[PDB]
Amino acid sequence: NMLTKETPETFYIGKLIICNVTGIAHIGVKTRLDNGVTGFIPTKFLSDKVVKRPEERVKVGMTVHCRIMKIDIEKFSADLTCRTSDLMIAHPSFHNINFKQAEKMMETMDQGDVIIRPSSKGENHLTVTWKVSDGIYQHVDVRATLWINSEEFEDLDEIVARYVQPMASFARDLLNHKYYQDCSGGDRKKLEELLIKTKKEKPTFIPYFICACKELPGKFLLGYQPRGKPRIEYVTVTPEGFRYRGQIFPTVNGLFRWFKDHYQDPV
Amino acid sequence: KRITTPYMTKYERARVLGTRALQIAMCAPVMVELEGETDPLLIAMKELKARKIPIIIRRYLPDGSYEDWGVDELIISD
Amino acid sequence: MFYHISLEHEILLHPRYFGPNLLNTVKQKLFTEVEGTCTGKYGFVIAVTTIDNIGAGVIQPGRGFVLYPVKYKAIVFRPFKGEVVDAVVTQVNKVGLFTEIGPMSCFISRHSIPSEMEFDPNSNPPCYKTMDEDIVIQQDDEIRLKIVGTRVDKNDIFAIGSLMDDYLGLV
Amino acid sequence: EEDASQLIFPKEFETAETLLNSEVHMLLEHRKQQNESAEDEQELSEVFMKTLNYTARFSRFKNRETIASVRSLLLQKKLHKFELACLANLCPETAEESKALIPSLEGRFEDEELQQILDDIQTKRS
Amino acid sequence: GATPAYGAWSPSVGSGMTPGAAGFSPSAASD
């Protein structure tokens, strides 16, 4: 008592006791513990068959934290467990990921499911990626500057249902339009050559279409040919509506009903 | 009622570039896209052309007054 | 005594703290600079209650720091000598009684105690009874006092109380 | 030289705003409320934690009306600012106790005038 | 970062001069 440095009444079963099994006698690693207790590793912790060391130890010996399963510091034994288990419709995903590898997992979900990922530039930042079209995604880099509070971060459920879910419902309506296309992602060279080919079959009736960008997601392309010159008008999709010539429309129908009586000006 | 020159003086240009380049070197947020360069003066120069330097120049008048001028406010020379 | 005054401070900020969170970061730096401190001028400030304004940050020539003269409102605690305060009795000892005036503690010798309030070390609780055991003045009692001398100890106030004045006891 | 008994205060402190013991309690507990109602918040200093209690022990009232009324009934008279707090915390049950405690009240007022200020203060007391 | 501000952008409007007549399509209801 007071000469051994440790008794078996201090070391208990269930608590992790770090064992220093730095040699093996004949299989398992017999080493010393922190309290001077001669740690003789059993088949439940040193695990050596005479053809090898512990494998979960070191490259030149044995050792590590293990779940304490035997109190024999006076008996020159240490039942330390070598195993780590002995010591102990618009869905919302979660994550912790880069940008390139995240692009391959967000192509298989449907339209409306919003993912949750950390940012990449800066600190204490979160990026809201929501599906827009086939290959079009708006990575809302909040501080796409969406200024928020500090109280909201503990509950990640409202920031989507107030800012992205209404935005996704407004973006889905233009996809189900009667005159929609992609032009291989909304390329600017492919869209000017389509308006000049549709005007020849019907010079009296002028058609209109709608498309979005792939490099600048969130901005739609509203092109119209009042005469023999192509012209492109842009529009932004907002969480409360749409931004068209600086006028905010509450519902998706008022934008088109406001455009049908506004494109007849000489500009 | 600012009465001073609406042009960025060569001396302002020198120390604003120098000052901003120092901040850059100290891991400041950049206000411009980096096309893949690393020099703080190169960055500072880029920022200058973009009129994105987050700096205002306090110009002292001889009487004791002063006028503050944003970088985006005054006409960059070079 | 608890007062409200406008104070001022000038703080230094490193370029890593620029960008959209800048003036928020200026507020954070003051809230964790001037709280719970003491001075030989103003005394013991309990907390900064609000920030008045930020003066435009003067960029330091040569070095990348910028300094921000921020004006702010502060609840300050400055005792003066001769003020008559309430306190709680902390420790009853033959060498003297210990009290606590908010962030500042005081001490009362048997010298300042007239001979009525005798010692009680025989009892489990140290008290100051009288001869007849009517007026019981023990630990953890709201006992009034009068600050008869101030002392600042390296940003630390330490006054001294007394019991010479009448009506210095239980309410 | 600095003795509040003879009402001598530094220029930095003369223009100062006096505070009541019950009054500051609302300021401190509201500051506790502001920060503790913030998520992702660092623990407040031991100096904050050790002071909230002091004013709590001496709460003559909590109520936001009585925070004003013991001041208004006093400011109407020709008292010093310094007198404002010492007389509104202690709540001396008579002008006699207050005049014994406070050397500045002695000859300053009628005892019955000062007693009515103190009786108005006692009738504010929770 | 590789992904800068997208929505902080300024949509520039395009000016034109087309003195045409009025022979275009009518409006509809909002329901």
From Swiss-Prot, chain A:
It is found in: Nucleus. Ubiquitously expressed. Residues 27-83 form the S1 motif domain. The modification Phosphotyrosine is found at Y263. Residues 89-179 form the SH2 domain. Histone H3-H4 chaperone that plays a key role in the regulation of transcription elongation and mRNA processing. Enhances the transcription elongation by RNA polymerase II (RNAPII) and is also required for the efficient activation of transcriptional elongation by the HIV-1 nuclear transcriptional activator, Tat. Besides chaperoning histones in transcription, acts to transport and splice mRNA by forming a complex with IWS1 and the C-terminal domain (CTD) of the RNAPII subunit RPB1 (POLR2A). Belongs to the SPT6 family. Interacts with RNA polymerase II and the DRB sensitivity-inducing factor complex (DSIF complex), which is composed of SUPT5H and SUPT4H1. Interacts with KDM6A. Interacts (via SH2 domain) with SETD1A. Interacts (via SH2 domain) with POLR2A phosphorylated at 'Ser-2'. Interacts with IWS1, AICDA and PAAF1. Interacts with histone H2B and H3. Interacts with WDR43. This is Transcription elongation factor SPT6. It comes from Homo sapiens. The chain holds residues 1151 to 1519 of 1726 of the full protein.
